[PDB]
């Protein structure tokens, strides 16, 4: 993933590490749904 | 700075501004040429010949003497060797770099995990290729000359 250090700041937003984890889970779910595994 | 380490060392020679050989030099041009030939036959490189001449014989530099056979040139160790038919077949710096690259490859084939020495080898090959490019451009090497580690062993030997 591309680096956006501006998003690591916690002012009015949740942790970027857990956002990244959620996005990766979403990507895996979409790939599984599409059948690409 | 340095080619790869990018350090700014400044140690080197500081030759005074001169146009003629110093008056206290005992030997003449002919004896200087004979000494150069004798040292080359003994088996020293050009740098070692010049160092020995400066140290033991007290000759500051052969480049201070005008060439008797060419009014437009000054004397030089390589020029003396080439006029006596004793110049090296390939340039000495290239020979030294090839020799130590071959030695490093011999070490690395017994120590495959020495990645730092492998990087040193890569730097040596880069220097070799730079010199090969320069000598190819200047015509001091055949146009078909290429550097290959397998064939470099015979050149080293």
């Amino acid at each position: 993933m591309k680096r956006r250090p501006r998003k690591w700041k916690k002012k009015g937003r949740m942790r970027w590490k857990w956002i990244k984890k959620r996005i990766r889970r979403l990507k895996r779910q979409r790939k599984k749904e599409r059948g690409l595994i | 700075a340095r080619m790869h380490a990018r350090k700014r060392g400044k140690s080197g020679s500081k030759r005074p501004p001169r146009t003629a050989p110093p008056i206290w030099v005992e030997y003449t041009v002919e004896e200087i040429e004979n000494l150069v030939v004798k040292l080359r036959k003994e088996g020293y490189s050009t740098a070692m010949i010049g160092t020995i001449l400066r140290d033991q014989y007290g000759i500051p530099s052969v480049k201070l003497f005008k060439d008797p056979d060419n009014p437009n040139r000054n004397l030089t160790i390589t020029r003396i060797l080439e006029k006596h038919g004793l110049a090296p077949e390939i340039p000495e710096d290239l020979m030294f770099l090839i020799r130590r690259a071959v030695n490093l490859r011999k070490h690395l084939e017994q120590h495959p995990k020495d990645l730092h020495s492998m990087r040193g080898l890569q730097l040596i090959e880069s220097k070799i290729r730079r010199l090969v490019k320069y000598y190819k451009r200047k015509g001091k090497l055949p146009k078909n000359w290429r550097y290959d580690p397998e064939t470099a062993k015979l050149l080293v030997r």
Binding site: - | R15, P16, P17, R18
Partner: protein, 129 residues
């Protein structure tokens, strides 16, 4: 590495003038640098300059009089005709006829004023004001 001895000389002169030095050394020296220094001395921006041999390209010893506001090389060396000098004057000088644009011409190195007087163009190599 070293690429522009003339630009190095002009930047060194500008820095020394800003810091208030009276004497500068230019190294390495060249005939283009000598011609430029001759033009500046003729126009009164620098004092006496002398060439010194050191077994190398040489050194130039120059005396400054505190009369230079800014001296700089022009890169790329733009070719300029006789009728195109006004835009370069506006680009490199504060007012009309204030400084001098040093131009290398086919008849030698001379200021843009003498180039206009002779009716010849050249290549802009420096500017001093």
């Amino acid at each position: 590495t070293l690429l522009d001895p003339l630009a190095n000389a002009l930047s060194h002169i500008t820095n020394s003038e800003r810091v208030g030095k009276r004497e500068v050394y230019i190294k390495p020296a060249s005939k283009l640098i000598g011609e430029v220094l001759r033009v500046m001395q003729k126009y009164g921006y620098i004092g006496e300059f002398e060439f010194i041999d050191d077994g190398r390209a040489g050194v130039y010893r120059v005396q400054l009089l505190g009369r230079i506001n800014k001296a700089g090389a022009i890169k790329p060396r733009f070719p300029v005709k006789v009728s195109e000098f006004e835009k370069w004057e506006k680009r490199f000088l504060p007012a009309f006829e204030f400084g001098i644009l040093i131009v290398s011409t086919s008849q030698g190195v001379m200021s843009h004023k003498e180039a206009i007087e002779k009716g010849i163009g050249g290549r802009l190599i420096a500017y001093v004001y």
